[PDB]
């Protein structure tokens, strides 16, 4: 209840700040005021156009690695087990497999950016 209360207090504080920031100062807006910024000239094309991504393979690898992190995260409770040999072997296997995948991608130039 207390955490929910303080989250709501933060929400109310930030909403109050942005509300007073939008309703306190004098408004004077026209077309050139609200045109988008392109260092003084008109934009040649819209910014909603496709914008090429040179680290897409690294992003997919980040998805897989983040799930490897999710697998590795119950370790502070796993170290309390009776059969610590099995836990230690399984954790070693998991981290070694993750490292081998990273090494294979590094060898196959997947970490390098395209073009």
């Amino acid at each position: 209840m207390n955490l929910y209360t303080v989250i709501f207090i933060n929400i109310l504080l930030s909403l109050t700040l942005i509300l007073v920031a939008f309703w306190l100062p004098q408004m004077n807006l026209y077309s050139e005021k609200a045109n988008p910024y392109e260092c003084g000239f008109d934009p040649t094309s819209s910014a909603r156009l496709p914008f090429s991504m040179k680290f897409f393979l690294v992003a997919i690898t980040f998805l897989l690695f983040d799930l490897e992190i999710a697998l590795l995260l119950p370790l502070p409770w796993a170290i309390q087990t009776i059969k610590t040999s099995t836990m230690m072997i399984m954790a070693f296997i998991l981290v070694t497999i993750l490292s081998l995948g990273l090494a294979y991608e590094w060898t196959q130039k997947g970490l390098e950016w395209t073009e």
Binding site: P25, M27, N28, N35, Y37, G40, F41
Partner: protein, 157 residues
């Protein structure tokens, strides 16, 4: 006078104090005058000590220091970045070029003073004006916007 008039005057003083203690120029310059402007930014004069800090985007800028020769090819861009600044904005022309064309007054490709393009609050003369002179112009602008009476005029409306 009325008690509310005194409160309005004090609120005007507070607003003017905030706006003159926080003057952020656009990171905008054109020439040798802008070289003297970064010599004002340099450790001797310390515009940051005065509270004056450059911001690259015109949206975060308060004042625009036109420091250099405003050409015909540059004038739409200068007007654009002036118009994209938010409303409490000021203009400090710097040097003879931005004031009245200067050494290139009779040129085919030079706007004869940036006051033909943007409304100039303060003119700083020189070619180049020293960083002392530009700092003097900044302090004079601070005094000018200390003199503003916006809430008092609104109350007297």
């Amino acid at each position: 006078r009325s008690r509310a008039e005194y409160v309005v005057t004090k609120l005007d003083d507070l607003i003017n104090w905030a706006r003159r203690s926080s003057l952020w120029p656009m990171t905008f310059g054109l020439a040798c005058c802008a070289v003297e402007m970064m010599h004002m930014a340099a450790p001797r004069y310390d515009m940051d000590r005065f509270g004056v800090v450059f911001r690259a985007s015109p949206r975060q800028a308060d004042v625009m220091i036109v420091a250099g020769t405003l050409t015909n090819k540059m004038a739409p861009a200068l007007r654009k970045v002036y118009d994209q600044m938010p409303e409490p904005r000021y203009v400090v022309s710097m040097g003879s070029c931005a004031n009245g064309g200067g050494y290139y007054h009779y040129s085919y490709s030079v706007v004869r003073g940036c006051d033909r393009i943007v409304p100039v609050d303060i003119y700083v003369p020189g070619c180049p004006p020293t960083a002392e002179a530009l700092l003097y112009g900044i302090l004079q602008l601070q005094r000018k916007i200390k003199r503003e009476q916006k809430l008092k005029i609104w109350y007297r409306r």
